[PDB]
Paper text:
Rescue of ribosomes stalled on nonstop mRNAs is essential for most bacterial species, and for mitochondrial translation in humans. The rescue systems tmRNA-SmpB, ArfA, and ArfB release the truncated translation product, allowing the ribosomes to be recycled for subsequent rounds of translation. Among the rescue systems, only ArfB is able to induce polypeptide release independent of canonical termination factors. The globular N-terminal domain contains the conserved GGQ motif essential for catalysis of peptidyl-tRNA hydrolysis.
In order to understand how longer mRNAs affect ArfB-mediated rescue, we determined the cryo-EM structures of ArfB bound to P + 0 and P + 9 E. coli ribosome complexes. The cryo-EM particle images were sorted in silico for ArfB occupancy and ribosome conformation yielding cryo-EM maps for the major states of P + 0 and P + 9 complexes at 3.7 Å and 2.6 Å resolution, respectively. The two structures are virtually identical within the error of resolution and depict ArfB bound to the ribosome in the post-hydrolysis state with Api137 and deacylated tRNAPhe in the P site. The absence of mRNA density past the P-site codon in the P + 9 state suggests that ArfB has displaced the mRNA 3′ extension from the mRNA entry channel. The mRNA is intact under these conditions, indicating that the A site overhang must have become disordered to allow accommodation of ArfB into the mRNA entry channel. Because the post-hydrolysis state is structurally very similar with P + 0 and P + 9 mRNAs, in the following we generally refer to the 2.6 Å cryo-EM structure of the P + 9 complex as the major P/P post-hydrolysis state. The present 2.6 Å cryo-EM map shows how ArfB interacts with the ribosome in the post-hydrolysis complex. In agreement with mutational data, the cryo-EM-based model shows that the essential residues Arg105, Arg118, Leu119, Lys122, Lys129, and Arg132 form intricate side chain contacts with the ribosomal RNA (rRNA), whereas most nonessential side chains that are not involved in any interactions are less well-resolved. The essential positively charged amino acids interact via their guanidinium and ε-amino groups with negatively charged groups of 16S rRNA (and 23S rRNA for Arg105), whereas the hydrophobic Leu119 stacks with its isobutyl group onto the guanine of G530. In the PTC, Gln28 in the universally conserved catalytic GGQ motif of ArfB retains a conformation poised for peptidyl-tRNA hydrolysis, which is stabilized by interaction with Api137.
Residue numbers in the entry:
A (entry chain 2): 1 to 46
B (entry chain v): 5 to 18
C (entry chain C): 1 to 271
D (entry chain T): 1 to 93
Write the structure that this text describes.
Amino acid sequence: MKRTFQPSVLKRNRSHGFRARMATKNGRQVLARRRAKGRARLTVSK
Amino acid sequence: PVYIPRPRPPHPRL
Amino acid sequence: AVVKCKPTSPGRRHVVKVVNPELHKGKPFAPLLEKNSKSGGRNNNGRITTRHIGGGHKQAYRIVDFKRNKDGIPAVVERLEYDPNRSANIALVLYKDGERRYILAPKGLKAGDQIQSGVDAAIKPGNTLPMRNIPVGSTVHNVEMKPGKGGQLARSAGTYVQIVARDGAYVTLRLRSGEMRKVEADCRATLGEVGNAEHMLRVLGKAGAARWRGVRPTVRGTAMNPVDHPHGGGEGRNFGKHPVTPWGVQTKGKKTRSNKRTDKFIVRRRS
Amino acid sequence: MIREERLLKVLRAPHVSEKASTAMEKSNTIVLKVAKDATKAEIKAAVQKLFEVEVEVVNTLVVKGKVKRHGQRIGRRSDWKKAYVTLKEGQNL
RNA sequence: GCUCGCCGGAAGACCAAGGGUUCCUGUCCAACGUUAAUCGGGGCAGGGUGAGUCGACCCCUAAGGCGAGGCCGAAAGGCGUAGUCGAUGGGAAACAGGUUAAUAUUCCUGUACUUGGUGUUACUGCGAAGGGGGGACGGAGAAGGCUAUGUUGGCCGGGCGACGGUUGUCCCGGUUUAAGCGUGUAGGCUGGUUUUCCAGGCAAAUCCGGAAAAUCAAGGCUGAGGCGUGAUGACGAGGCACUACGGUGCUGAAGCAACAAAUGCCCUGCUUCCAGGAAAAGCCUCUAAGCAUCAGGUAACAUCAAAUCGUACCCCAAACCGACACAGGUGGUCAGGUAGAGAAUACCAAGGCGCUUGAGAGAACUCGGGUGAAGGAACUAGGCAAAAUGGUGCCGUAACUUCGGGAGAAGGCACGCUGAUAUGUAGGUGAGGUCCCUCGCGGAUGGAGCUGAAAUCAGUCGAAGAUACCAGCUGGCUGCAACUGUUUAUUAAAAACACAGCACUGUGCAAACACGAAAGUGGACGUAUACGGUGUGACGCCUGCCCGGUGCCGGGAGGUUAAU
RNA sequence: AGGACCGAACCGACUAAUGUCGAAAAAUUAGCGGAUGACUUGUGGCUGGGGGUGAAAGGCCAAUCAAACCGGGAGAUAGCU
Ligand SMILES: [Mg+2]
Ligand SMILES: [Mg+2]
Ligand SMILES: [Mg+2]
Ligand SMILES: [Mg+2]
Ligand SMILES: [Mg+2]
Ligand SMILES: [Mg+2]
Ligand SMILES: [Mg+2]
Ligand SMILES: [Mg+2]
Ligand SMILES: [Mg+2]
Ligand SMILES: [Mg+2]
Ligand SMILES: [Mg+2]
Ligand SMILES: [Mg+2]
Ligand SMILES: [Mg+2]
Ligand SMILES: [Mg+2]
Ligand SMILES: [Mg+2]
Ligand SMILES: [Mg+2]
Ligand SMILES: [Mg+2]
Ligand SMILES: [Mg+2]
Ligand SMILES: [Mg+2]
Ligand SMILES: [Mg+2]
Ligand SMILES: [Mg+2]
Ligand SMILES: [Mg+2]
Ligand SMILES: [Mg+2]
Ligand SMILES: [Mg+2]
Ligand SMILES: [Mg+2]
Ligand SMILES: [Mg+2]
Ligand SMILES: [Mg+2]
Ligand SMILES: [Mg+2]
Ligand SMILES: [Mg+2]
Ligand SMILES: [Mg+2]
Ligand SMILES: [Mg+2]
Ligand SMILES: [Mg+2]
Ligand SMILES: [Mg+2]
Ligand SMILES: [Mg+2]
Ligand SMILES: [Mg+2]
Ligand SMILES: [Mg+2]
Ligand SMILES: [Mg+2]
Ligand SMILES: [Mg+2]
Ligand SMILES: [Mg+2]
Ligand SMILES: [Mg+2]
Ligand SMILES: [Mg+2]
Ligand SMILES: [Mg+2]
Ligand SMILES: [Mg+2]
Ligand SMILES: [Mg+2]
Ligand SMILES: [Mg+2]
Ligand SMILES: [Mg+2]
Ligand SMILES: [Mg+2]
Ligand SMILES: [Mg+2]
Ligand SMILES: [Mg+2]
Ligand SMILES: [Mg+2]
Ligand SMILES: [Mg+2]
Ligand SMILES: [Mg+2]
Ligand SMILES: [Mg+2]
Ligand SMILES: [Mg+2]
Ligand SMILES: [Mg+2]
Ligand SMILES: [Mg+2]
Ligand SMILES: [Mg+2]
Ligand SMILES: [Mg+2]
Ligand SMILES: [Mg+2]
Ligand SMILES: [Mg+2]
Ligand SMILES: [Mg+2]
Ligand SMILES: [Mg+2]
Ligand SMILES: [Mg+2]
Ligand SMILES: [Mg+2]
Ligand SMILES: [Mg+2]
Ligand SMILES: [Mg+2]
Ligand SMILES: [Mg+2]
Ligand SMILES: [Mg+2]
Ligand SMILES: [Mg+2]
Ligand SMILES: [Mg+2]
Ligand SMILES: [Mg+2]
Ligand SMILES: [Mg+2]
Ligand SMILES: [Mg+2]
Ligand SMILES: [Mg+2]
Ligand SMILES: [Mg+2]
Ligand SMILES: [Mg+2]
Ligand SMILES: [Mg+2]
Ligand SMILES: [Mg+2]
Ligand SMILES: [Mg+2]
Ligand SMILES: [Mg+2]
Ligand SMILES: [Mg+2]
Ligand SMILES: [Mg+2]
Ligand SMILES: [Mg+2]
Ligand code: NA
């Protein structure tokens, strides 16, 4: 049984990383929402 | 929980 | 030559090959090659815009000289070569000045034949010159649509254009489709038919043969659900519709040509 | 020429352990906890300047801090750089 | 610790990915561990990851991304040029031995190599966002040469045995050694060299391409492996001493040959086929502007530098993905012996394990197996399941057929061991020797040694010799689908889908068509022997009549008819 | 030579049994199919919700699919319980 989560750090950062978020107007609104909510981890960047 | 399995199908009273 | 394979297996029983012993059994001319990546039928947006495209053999692009604008300089045919990008074969051709080019191979072209382009070339097959120095009634190919544009008509295997009439700055051509079209008399055309007229005699035998030409399977609209095609639906082989495209437009005879800016050049449409 | 104010930051401590003892014992290698930046050239210059010994070569590694659970909180110790400084021939001073 | 059992194309070893300290040591046993736990991947503390050469970084590019300007778009933004990123690909260089509780191609010993910088010397044309070459490329197949590796013999060390025998064609163990450097081989490719000229390589070119002439006929490129050296070194069975009895130190014989042999290497080769098989840089070469004293280049020698980051540990798994210490999933590399065609299979090696509740008992019943009188499908929806068949060689094999098949049709015979043919044959390999040379990794002869099927004849044992494991049931009629393939991840694998073939139809290229407010993109760097849509669905024989309805195509006289 | 044959790896999933608060939210065991191709697989990339992709089952699109998920309109509305 292959499951849905097949981790890959490169794909993770290219898909949801900080620079991926900053690339688009909508990704920068994700960061604004998570900053407003007070999220300790802003992105998947560690 | 977070996952509730679908109940088994009833006997087809058809 | 048209060779029928022997039925040593299904998928081999119905294969008919077009095996030309005169084609170069080596690597193509590397300076005239470049990368030609597949698209899968996907466009700029990444969406399938043409269907049934995908896979197939990797193939390099041969830079074929369609313009044929090296005028006066004679050229000798040194090779006939297989081209994965055409139904026609190409000819590697060496010019007297030491330049090599690929051209479409006319019907009876061989290694060692002399070809040249320009207003003063002979009426040999494979010679290119404006359709103002070509006689009327002569059979040509690789015909330009605009002077200097390069040559867009009659480029498939066995195809050719007939120079039917000639009235001033224009020449009427019978195209391979049966259409009469006006084209500027300053447009170049190569003399003769395109070679490899046996190309349409191949049979491919099996599904994998089409698959490795980059052709992916075609699902019939009837075989689908009503949500997928205008055909589709039914409790077992129902049609009851008029045949249409996947986007609802009548196929089975409905003219889709709408130009209005090139109608002046079409003397008579195909029949 | 690395400046002495930088050399005086490069070195942090000597690393005391069984492997460090054995290295100084039978290979003439002193083991140091150095700064994090701490290039090999900076470490060599700093050792030769401050300990006034003759350095042959510097091998460096980064030690990643351990995740420790102090009380009921998850903490992590700092990564630090370790330098194996091989002295040339004479001795430590 | 001694036995026993299990895996051993893994349940061993090494990695990538992923994880992130789980690694090692000491200590503790609350919780965790499906039980106890003194133990642990658990708690606590300490230690542990050492690189010019490995990898990343770096240089280069693919798909693709972003994208100055630009084009387009209510805005947001889309596309895209120059460019710039982007590996899963291309690009410099290190091996063997030793060592830690834990790292090692990183430490140490020994022996190397690479690329740059700076100098000195000597000789000189150097010079690029530019040109050319190269890099640089498919599938399949076959063979030869090899090696890894194994077997045997020889050699060396040890043994002579708990129950008969065992000083012998007896038993046990070892018999290892790299990169680098030199040689240039089996082999592959290629005719070289000089001169002259040229409308080509955006300009130039001495380079490439082309042409002619002469001349010599060889040169050049590539290349496994072997050999020499590396290496009077290392390692080395064992022996010798001391205890932390875990190990530490010292010494150290032989260290050869033959045969067999890869799926590895030569080989990015060769042959062949069609479906016609990356790019760019490094690299080599050519010049332009430019500088020609300089700069720069080339070659020696010297010196300097090679940073930074990763390196522990798991990695078919208790450490990753599955909520679990979960019978699941997870890419690559290595892969010994006997039998075997084999990476099957059985038993083993190295190595690793006994799967984290046990102890009894020996009811029904359930599960997984074994055997079964007589019968033999009577069972049942249905031979479901089970049983059965099963290998090799040879003999033999029907209808039908699209001439390929059917077919391994069906059936049948032989098969172990021993001896002889023949103190091991046919075959393979191949030393010495003896010649020959345009002398070396050479050629010819030569056959020592090694290895070695298969067969026949004779004998012989058993109920049985393809003895285990392994390993087709076969035949007859018929529907459907031509066929290989695909599908409802997780109740449907099919007659459904696809398919080659066929037909209709559209499309003349700024194609139709599709995605897109558009720009644009796909179609296609294609051009009617092409492309799209639709239906049918190999092949064979064929495909009849109806245009009234609906559609589509054509006409446009007349009637009706919008904005205006 | 071959979408050739037999058969491991590998990819599948035809039959049966077990399991069905499972060892497992799809397995195991014994058989079974393909196994040089329309094959399989790693890494990276692209296509997105009336959208994609689909050898077509309304299949798949993160254990969710005749219109994914998350947040919002939103305390939708509910003559119904
Ligand atoms: Mg992604
Ligand atoms: Mg199509
Ligand atoms: Mg079709
Ligand atoms: Mg179809
Ligand atoms: Mg159907
Ligand atoms: Mg259907
Ligand atoms: Mg509809
Ligand atoms: Mg229908
Ligand atoms: Mg239907
Ligand atoms: Mg019906
Ligand atoms: Mg009807
Ligand atoms: Mg060092
Ligand atoms: Mg380091
Ligand atoms: Mg811990
Ligand atoms: Mg441990
Ligand atoms: Mg412990
Ligand atoms: Mg207790
Ligand atoms: Mg307990
Ligand atoms: Mg612990
Ligand atoms: Mg690109
Ligand atoms: Mg862009
Ligand atoms: Mg802009
Ligand atoms: Mg780059
Ligand atoms: Mg890479
Ligand atoms: Mg990178
Ligand atoms: Mg270790
Ligand atoms: Mg220029
Ligand atoms: Mg050998
Ligand atoms: Mg060897
Ligand atoms: Mg021996
Ligand atoms: Mg003795
Ligand atoms: Mg005795
Ligand atoms: Mg040779
Ligand atoms: Mg193989
Ligand atoms: Mg100089
Ligand atoms: Mg020199
Ligand atoms: Mg390690
Ligand atoms: Mg370990
Ligand atoms: Mg357990
Ligand atoms: Mg497990
Ligand atoms: Mg085997
Ligand atoms: Mg096995
Ligand atoms: Mg019992
Ligand atoms: Mg039985
Ligand atoms: Mg019975
Ligand atoms: Mg009996
Ligand atoms: Mg009986
Ligand atoms: Mg009977
Ligand atoms: Mg009955
Ligand atoms: Mg009955
Ligand atoms: Mg029944
Ligand atoms: Mg059965
Ligand atoms: Mg059975
Ligand atoms: Mg041999
Ligand atoms: Mg028998
Ligand atoms: Mg079977
Ligand atoms: Mg019937
Ligand atoms: Mg039929
Ligand atoms: Mg079928
Ligand atoms: Mg198949
Ligand atoms: Mg599929
Ligand atoms: Mg299903
Ligand atoms: Mg179902
Ligand atoms: Mg099924
Ligand atoms: Mg189907
Ligand atoms: Mg049909
Ligand atoms: Mg039919
Ligand atoms: Mg009809
Ligand atoms: Mg009519
Ligand atoms: Mg009309
Ligand atoms: Mg096959
Ligand atoms: Mg399998
Ligand atoms: Mg499937
Ligand atoms: Mg099944
Ligand atoms: Mg088959
Ligand atoms: Mg098979
Ligand atoms: Mg992928
Ligand atoms: Mg349906
Ligand atoms: Mg799902
Ligand atoms: Mg809806
Ligand atoms: Mg919602
Ligand atoms: Mg509201
Ligand atoms: Mg409500
Ligand atoms: Na009609």
